[PDB]
Amino acid sequence: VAAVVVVGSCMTDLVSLTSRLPKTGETIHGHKFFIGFGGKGANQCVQAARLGAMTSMVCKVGKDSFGNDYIENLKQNDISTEFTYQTKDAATGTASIIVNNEGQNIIVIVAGANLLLNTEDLRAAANVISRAKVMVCQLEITPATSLEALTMARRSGVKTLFNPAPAIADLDPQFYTLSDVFCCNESEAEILTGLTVGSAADAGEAALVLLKRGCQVVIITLGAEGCVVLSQTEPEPKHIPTEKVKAVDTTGAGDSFVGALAFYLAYYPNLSLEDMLNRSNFIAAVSVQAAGTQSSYPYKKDLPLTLFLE
Amino acid sequence: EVAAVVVVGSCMTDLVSLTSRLPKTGETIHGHKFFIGFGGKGANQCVQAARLGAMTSMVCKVGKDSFGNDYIENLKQNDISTEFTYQTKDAATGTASIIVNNEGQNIIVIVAGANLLLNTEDLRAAANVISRAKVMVCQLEITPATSLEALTMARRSGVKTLFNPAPAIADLDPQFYTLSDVFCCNESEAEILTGLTVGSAADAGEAALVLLKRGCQVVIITLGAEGCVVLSQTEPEPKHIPTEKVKAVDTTGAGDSFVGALAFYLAYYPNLSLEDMLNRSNFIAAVSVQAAGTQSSYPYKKDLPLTLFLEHHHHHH
Ligand SMILES: Nc1ncnc2c1ncn2[C@@H]1O[C@H](COP(=O)(O)OP(=O)(O)CP(=O)(O)O)[C@@H](O)[C@H]1O
Ligand SMILES: Nc1ncnc2c1ncn2[C@@H]1O[C@H](COP(=O)(O)OP(=O)(O)CP(=O)(O)O)[C@@H](O)[C@H]1O
Ligand code: NA
Ligand code: NA
Ligand code: NA
Ligand code: NA
After folding, report:
1. Which cofactor does it need (chain B)?
2. Does the CB of B103 have a partner CB in chain A at under 8 Å?
3. Residue nearest to ligand 1 atom 22, measured at CA
């Protein structure tokens, strides 16, 4: 039985590495290009799977080469594709990513078949959703479809992990009240609250705003600074540091973090939040030490044993 | 069997996203359409020549990857010889990632990739094709030393050299001028190359004379809707070749269409005046600007007035 069900996105990542970002009108040269398997949903599901979770990926890709390749990718990662659909009416989603090694990126998503995943497609997955431990959603599919997946999870007492990524300033208030765990990064927290986040302290203040919108637990990820967490029971923010490492490629680190979190909510439900986050930070930091997104996500066998004890 | 037009240059996969706004640093935005297209100045030029009826050969390097295989098939679908289209496991096929807003402004990230690995040994194996051609066409999207060597090879074999210094760099090796029988660039490229402003046919004439005196035999500056301006060592007074008003849908790649047409005329209509060649090339590029999508807008002979293929002088097409 799948313990972690992800209802969300698969994208073909078209990645260019550059030393600067381009400005309007401008052509710049990068030094490398590669294709990867991406999408926040799938990335999260892949990390959870590699840690040993039994997972199911509920998603929609194209009846195109990239979509066929995506399905094979999911199978190679031991992820159930029972509810991975293909449509001839849109192409597999695409994420064009420019990664500037000398600062912030730019991403352009054409979500394609992701946006055709509908409430009828979820209904077929109703038995899987209700027998799971954790349901994970993001904002790369139609928001109404994520909302329904959260609602279905809540009705069966399944823990909801929501990642509001990429963030929308006017997010439906139900996303907060249907989230047991609400996890976003610094720039997303800014978009969602209108506040500036330049410090662990600032993140704590943004997290409290989100908490008061009805989340049970809020986590803001902070790159090399780890994360900050608070909850309804314990509303004082805690700053959990991460492993000090030399980052090669941080792309998708957040997804690694969230997939780890899903794994621990599902298989180690009695751990303190602070423990789970220490472990999830450790995992995500392993991902930043290598190139790519999914190809840098570690397997259980390569990770210290203490990450799997209780 | 023998190719009359050999292009030594670039092939790039165009990865195009249409959005309502461009992203600022740090931003993720949604676009509303994505598509894959065949670009690279070298291949674009080769394609236009081929569609006009040239026997062409594309000397280039792509990846041993799916985009590279697709590129090869594109060249074959256009009846271009791919004998010296190389594939390498050491880099991916060149890419141009293009984000375009609603008003038509863009940001572009090029990863030239396998294009840069086309080397002088690769050209040496293509020596028989280079040396037996009528025209050799190069640009500045591969390693400059490779294009220089292509030009040197073509010159010593009596093959006419058509050089397009695109994209332009300010400090171009002087040999690019002295090896060029026909040196053809656009207004913004001319400005980069000379520091002069080109806001008029007269201005273009002045920039062209600076380029001439660096040792080119013929200099052409393209001027978008204003046609082109040309001069030569034998006729150093610049001439303005205007073009009739058309309704432009998408000008992307018009310069490549122009250059590919010119290569076709140099190779297959050598007795036409240069000004006739350039008048016909203007017409052909202008057809390209009336339709979307770069190589897909490049016309075939069957789509063109027959007066473009007359062996004697003909002005109005
Ligand atoms: N430089 C670094 N060193 C160690 N860990 C890091 C790191 N950057 C990120 N991480 C880890 O990954 C988590 C996710 O961080 P964050 O959400 O900032 O990533 P992201 O996916 O937004 C990065 P990118 O913008 O490059 O895709 C952090 O909480 C931390 O555990
Ligand atoms: N609006 C228009 N109407 C008619 N012909 C046009 C045109 N725009 C371009 N052309 C034709 O295409 C040729 C090349 O145009 P241009 O000078 O724009 O080069 P280019 O395509 O390299 C500019 P860029 O590198 O900005 O895209 C012109 O000389 C002309 O023959
Ligand atoms: Na994230
Ligand atoms: Na990584
Ligand atoms: Na051009
Ligand atoms: Na066009």
Report:
1. Mg(2+)
2. no
3. A254
Spatial distance between the Cα atoms of B300 and B243, rounded to a whole number of angstroms: 20
Phi-psi region of A112 (alpha: psi -120 to 50; beta: other; left: phi over 0): left
Say which residues have a Cβ less than 8 Å from residue A80's Cβ, sequence separation at least 6: A2, A54, A55, A56, A57, A128
Q: What architecture does CATH give domain B1-317?
A: 3-Layer(aba) Sandwich (3.40)
Rounded to whole angstroms, the Cα distance separating B180 from B302 reads 32
Of A16, A107, A187, the CB nearest to B111: A16
List the residue whose alpha carbon is closest to atom 1 of ligand 1.
A224
Verify whether residue B256 is a known catalytic residue. yes
| Residue A22 CA, ligand 3 centroid: distance in Å | 23
Q: How far is B94 from chain A (nearest CA, A)?
A: 8
Alpha-carbon B93 to chain mean position:
19
The residues spanned by each domain of chain B are: 1-317
Task: Report CA torsion sign: A183, A267, A38, A221.
Answer: positive
Measured at the alpha carbon of residue A4, what is the angle toward residues A173 and A307, in degrees to the nearest 5? 110
Beta carbons of B9 and B24 less than 8 angstroms apart = no
Element (H, E) at B16: strand B12-18
Q: How far is the CA of A110 from the centre of ligand 4 (A)?
A: 22
Select from A47, A242, A281, A286 the residue to mutate for testing ligand 1; criterion: most ligand atoms less than 8 Å from CB. Answer: A242
Question: Helix or strand or coil: residue B168?
Answer: coil
Method of structure determination: X-ray
Q: Residue A216, Cβ neighbours under 10 Å: how many?
A: 17
Structure tokens at A143: 């928001």
